[PDB]
Design brief:
This protein has 13 helices and five strands. By secondary structure, it is mainly alpha-helical.
């Protein structure tokens, strides 16, 4: 286990640096069925199909633009991001049965995969007979956050504003910057064009941090 998904250093397109299969293993990915989300026309009903619901509008914002079958991969990633956010916000929960009680019936295999790869399992044969026990330490928190940020990069077309994201995740902007750099993303001041697109003053562009990914990926 490393803090980031496995990067494809030889990617020729930014979407291939952290492909969907590096974020969600193929065996687990086949269980993320999103056809029902695409077919649902009512926004409120579409949202109810997700594995976690909270008081945030974040997943709801990303969802509005995902209406066509060509966007299936991005929708699978958004579904998984919802689940990772659910695990992250409920990180104090220390057992599988108790975790499922906070979620909206995600396929069990996805939860098992998350506990196996993003937590410190509480080992023991007596405990294992009762349920899967674990805790999420600071290194695990960084790993969940790096997988979340890797998905956000796909959903934001590889141009991410630091400040609004930090507010959403309840993190210091410096922490979001640090995690993007662990992912090999480039974090620097907004270019003139980026400032115009994000609706921020042109004079403040250099101080407004943006995370980007570009091919060829860093070595």
């Amino acid at each position: 286990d490393r803090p980031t998904p496995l990067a494809n250093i030889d990617a020729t397109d930014v979407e291939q640096i952290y492909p969907i299969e590096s974020i969600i293993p193929k065996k687990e990915l086949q269980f993320i069925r999103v056809s029902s989300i695409l077919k649902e026309a009512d926004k409120e009903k579409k949202l109810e199909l997700f594995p976690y619901q909270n008081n945030s509008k974040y997943v709801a914002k990303k969802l509005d633009s995902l209406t066509q079958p060509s966007q299936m991969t991005k929708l699978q990633m958004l579904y998984y991001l919802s689940l990772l956010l659910g695990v992250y916000e409920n990180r104090r929960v220390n057992n599988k049965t108790k975790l499922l009680e906070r979620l909206n019936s995600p396929p069990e295999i996805l939860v098992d995969g998350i506990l196996s790869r993003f937590t410190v399992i509480k080992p023991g044969q007596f405990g294992r007979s009762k349920d899967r026990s674990y805790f999420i330490d600071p290194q695990n928190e960084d790993k969940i956050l790096c997988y979340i940020l890797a998905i956000i990069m796909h959903l934001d077309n590889f141009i991410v504003e630091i400040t609004p994201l930090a507010h959403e995740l309840n993190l210091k902007p410096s922490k979001v910057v640090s995690l993007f750099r662990v992912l090999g993303a480039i974090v620097k001041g907004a270019t003139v064009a980026q400032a115009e697109a994000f609706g921020i003053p042109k004079s403040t562009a250099a101080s407004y941090k943006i995370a980007t990914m570009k091919v060829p990926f860093k070595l």
